[PDB]
Design a protein around this ligand. Structure first.
Ligand SMILES: CNC[C@H](CC1CCCCC1)NC(=O)N1CCC[C@@H]([C@@](O)(CCCNC(C)=O)c2cccc(Cl)c2)C1
Ligand SMILES: CNC[C@H](CC1CCCCC1)NC(=O)N1CCC[C@@H]([C@@](O)(CCCNC(C)=O)c2cccc(Cl)c2)C1
Ligand SMILES: CNC[C@H](CC1CCCCC1)NC(=O)N1CCC[C@@H]([C@@](O)(CCCNC(C)=O)c2cccc(Cl)c2)C1
Ligand SMILES: CNC[C@H](CC1CCCCC1)NC(=O)N1CCC[C@@H]([C@@](O)(CCCNC(C)=O)c2cccc(Cl)c2)C1
Ligand SMILES: *[C@@H]1O[C@H](CO)[C@@H](O[C@@H]2O[C@H](CO)[C@@H](O)[C@H](O)[C@H]2NC(C)=O)[C@H](O)[C@H]1NC(C)=O
Ligand SMILES: *[C@@H]1O[C@H](CO)[C@@H](O)[C@H](O)[C@H]1NC(C)=O
Lengths: 337, 333
């Protein structure tokens, strides 16, 4: 086949990026995060009790309204480190761009307020591999590949910084290729450590010209579902000490005046420096010496086998257009625009 | 005189405990946390923009629906752990149990989704001292003290584990239906703060922290027990717990044989077993169970300090005594 296919994302405040998918006949539409850190598709279910406020606020899939729905009912429990969701397996046709595919997905009936009452999206489309898929359900991109409609077995992500203009594209995922409007130059390719997770070795992370963390090597998950860049508690503590940043309940902060003069942070990837400046990684709500500004970075201890490991999320992806390549088990990075 | 008065609390999932107050004529009712760690009363305002999701899902105070509302309008900003809420000052009559009082409170018009889209409660009634009150507003308990109605100038807290009563605050005394034996009374460090000296935190029989002294804020608005980041890192090591983004956990099967944790307060050991501080949702080795304890760096002047929150209070019924500037603990029942 010869399909490239694009899906427009809305950017909520530079921490959530989601697009629309349609499930069923006729399609019930859902806002979903496309998460290379996970491999299951789920949406909240019309069987989810209104005891879960997340099921009052979000859109719900009603199977009995879909003529292509096929019952399964097997339990599914997705125990993310942030919060477990539970429900049951269902099968139906899922539209993503112009691409239609019969997919097994979770109908979610338990959805905790932390974190789901903070979510502007309803559901998740896991773009990881079957090796991370709970209950061994074939992931949506695998079923898309089997169709043999795509140009290349690749998909790609553009995340934009949030802008005022109702005309601004929040972001874009391309299935089957990448979109040259959204990056400059050529891709630098980095081989996966292994098939099964979107993860690469990293040689180092430099604060200023000094490669002070990860000096003897570490892992990086390129994780389009992570809002911030994250590293292990021990790494992040050292990084933050290096910036002079203070830990609060939910973020790290610097006085907003001090932001622009913080040193660059560079991630040494496939033998190149991926550099974020303090313009890339500090939310500068202002430049007041009396105000504190959040860094788009925190500590998240990912448990083995995936961790310990950094996650290069939206903070990183905004600068670097990211191509996830299934045929060659590699990730390409180019400079976004 | 002679008034005591109780407010029944709803227990939401062992982490939020909130009762009802009525503000205005007729009374508009709010779910509120009674927080000994702060000193302002506030509720969300009808003024709050529906852009704040928290103002859609929470009860809103509409000042024009009350014949007792008196305008004021001073800007108000409250800084908590979780961040800031903004609004302005209004005055009205507030009902808390059988007691009615004229109270200046905040009508909040800015309520960030993190954290307020997590709260079952609508607002907060500060039970702390005027010293800690923002914009120098007289705290509700001082207003109630001025009325000469309370039996004794004390109030007290019972928090249940999720019997049927979620909890109870008594204004003017303590309820014997909810504690057993006698109170042990401990001086406050200073007026201005519901904070006492602590002289050690032990894990089993091993004092591990606070050997030379530290502070314990007795903090009814805290869901867990909290300590400084460094003390909690050391405590969690002793317990074999692992940090995750939002919690510390042990494997659920390891829960029951964790050692006791003890707080040395007013010369006696206040001990929590692992049944008291591990949320045992399961006992499976395949599952991770959250500890009802975390880090919170509380800033000067008040901190560094521990905060004895609901995890502690479930076991120890607590009396806050303004006449004597002390706290008493009795074993809850
Ligand atoms: C596995 N791969 C990383 C995971 C993926 C996550 C997807 C939702 C289900 C839970 C798993 N992410 C992640 O562990 N973290 C930290 C916790 C908060 C997340 C997040 O901020 C991310 C939102 C979606 N991300 C983007 C860039 O659009 C969030 C915010 C508010 C509510 C909720 Cl439920 C989650 C970001
Ligand atoms: C551009 N605006 C910036 C402001 C700054 C913010 C800092 C903390 C308190 C004040 C507001 N807001 C922000 O950044 N927000 C919104 C709320 C949820 C955050 C976040 O989604 C972040 C996940 C980060 N970590 C990953 C990806 O590994 C989240 C979700 C669930 C729980 C928690 Cl504690 C935090 C993301
Ligand atoms: C100053 N005194 C301690 C403060 C008090 C708090 C009062 C409400 C507004 C913010 C200040 N609490 C506190 O610093 N922490 C840690 C952060 C989360 C809190 C909390 O879990 C507390 C629940 C209230 N507590 C009980 C027992 O009912 C929570 C949960 C979900 C949403 C929100 Cl807004 C807050 C518990
Ligand atoms: C009995 N059920 C137990 C489960 C355990 C849950 C923990 C997260 C991952 C695993 C499951 N749920 C719980 O424990 N919850 C509910 C969510 C809000 C938490 C909490 O209220 C705790 C505050 C703690 N710190 C204090 C008080 O000083 C919280 C956490 C993050 C942000 C905000 Cl605003 C509020 C308290
Ligand atoms: C739901 O999904 C499960 C997993 O695919 C299906 O179970 C398999 O189905 C066939 C029997 O028709 C067997 O060959 C496999 O052994 C089954 N696997 C397991 C793990 O039991 C199940 O049939 C599907 N459910 C429905 C209702 O169609
Ligand atoms: C609000 O209350 C304060 C109390 O200090 C008072 O001085 C001020 O005049 C009040 N404002 C109005 C408009 O009444």
């Amino acid at each position: 086949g010869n399909t490239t296919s694009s899906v427009i994302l809305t950017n909520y405040m530079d921490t959530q990026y989601y697009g629309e998918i349609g499930i069923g006949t006729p399609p019930q539409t859902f806002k979903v995060v496309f998460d290379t850190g996970s491999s299951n598709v789920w949406v909240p279910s019309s069987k989810c009790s209104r005891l879960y406020t997340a099921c009052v606020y979000h859109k719900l899939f009603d199977a009995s309204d879909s003529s292509s729905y096929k019952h399964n009912g097997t339990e599914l429990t997705l125990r993310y480190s942030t919060g477990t969701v539970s429900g049951f397996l269902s099968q139906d046709i899922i539209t993503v761009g112009g691409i239609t595919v019969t997919q097994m997905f979770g109908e979610v009936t338990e959805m905790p307020a932390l974190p789901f009452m903070l979510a502007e999206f309803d559901g998740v489309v896991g773009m990881g591999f079957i090796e991370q898929a709970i209950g061994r359900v074939t992931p949506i991109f695998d079923n898309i590949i089997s169709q043999g409609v795509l140009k290349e077995d690749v998909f790609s992500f553009y995340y934009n910084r949030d802008s005022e203009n109702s005309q601004s594209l929040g972001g874009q995922i391309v299935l089957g290729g990448s979109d040259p409007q959204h990056y400059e130059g050529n891709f630098h390719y980095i081989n996966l450590i292994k098939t099964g997770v979107w993860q690469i070795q990293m040689k180092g992370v430099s604060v200023g010209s000094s490669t002070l963390l990860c000096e003897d090597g570490c892992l990086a998950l390129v994780d389009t579902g992570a809002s911030y860049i994250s590293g292990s508690t021990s790494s992040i503590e050292k990084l933050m000490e290096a910036l002079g940043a203070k830990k609060r309940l939910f973020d790290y902060v610097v006085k907003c005046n001090e932001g622009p003069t913080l040193p660059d942070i560079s991630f040494h990837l496939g033998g190149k420096e991926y550099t974020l400046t303090s313009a890339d990684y500090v939310f500068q709500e202002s430049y007041s010496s009396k105000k504190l500004c959040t860094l788009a970075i925190h500590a998240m201890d990912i448990p083995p086998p995936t961790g310990p490991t950094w996650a290069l999320g939206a903070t990183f992806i905004r600068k670097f257009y990211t191509e996830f390549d299934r045929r060659n088990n590699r990730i390409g990075f180019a400079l976004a625009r």
